[PDB]
Amino acid sequence: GLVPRGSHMVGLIWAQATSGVIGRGGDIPWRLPEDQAHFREITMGHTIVMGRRTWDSLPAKVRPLPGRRNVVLSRQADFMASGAEVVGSLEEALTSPETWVIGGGQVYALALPYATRCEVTEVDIGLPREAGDALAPVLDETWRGETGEWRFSRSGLRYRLYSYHRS
Template sequence: MSSAWAEPVRGVGMVWARSTTGVIGADGGMPWHVPEDLTHFRQVTDGATVVMGRRTWASLPERFRPLPGRRNVVLTRDASWAATDEAAGAEVVHDLATALDTDEPVWITGGGQVYAAGLPFADRVSETVIDVDVPGDTVAPALAEADDWDLVDEGPWRESRVGGTRYRFLEWRRRA
């Protein structure tokens, strides 16, 4: 399959890394360390608006908040959170429609509730599959089981330079 990502990115995308069993998070973090996935995340989202939930924002190391080179939008129901020190560097919104109201490319970056709410608006997904079976409390949407998504690029399995964990990149597009 050829890469569909060479074309300009418009609309709403989602990006995540998941285990082979669908886990994307455990106890507020990722249950693996694959530096190549972090590099991929940065390349995919660079220059775009990234939309994430408050807990995903909190899971980022402080030195990476806000994510550089991107407009950082944090979605929360807590109206008082914007005034806290933790919100420094974030554009805080309280509904998904406001978060997605831009002419710039948007990438939804987590967590589970934000992915679920954003899935009907997404037209593409950049997914890293990590070849591990780990326990977790947050899972990715199951695109392979959905009737309206096509796998457009399936990268080869590779080994991480740290620990040798296998991973691969998948790219999905919503059918027109």
């Protein structure tokens, strides 16, 4: 369904291990180049919102992510995010008709109450939760959606896509 341009659709998009781990040591603890393709089709041409630590985790070669208005949340007024914009709270981050929150753990939790879509790649990797891990947000019972089929990446890693939505 098309988004009426006067509304404010907020989506979250992330990839997680079975356990819910999404981040560890300032990085994503797997590599799934196939997952980048879905990430691009979902986010291209819209505003993307990320926490400062996720900005730090982006490779300099793709930073800011092209074709998208990059917004970084930080409480550091002097933060340097070249080619992006830095806002100090959530309200000014979510002003676009369509916004995709692209991480990390803190900012997913912050934005979830306002979101009506989650695009979730589940990676079949057994990484138990560890102290300091960044984690996927917990979805309450208002969400619903579709579970995709498992597929192998070129590397042999198995993954599948969940598309969740709510009113």
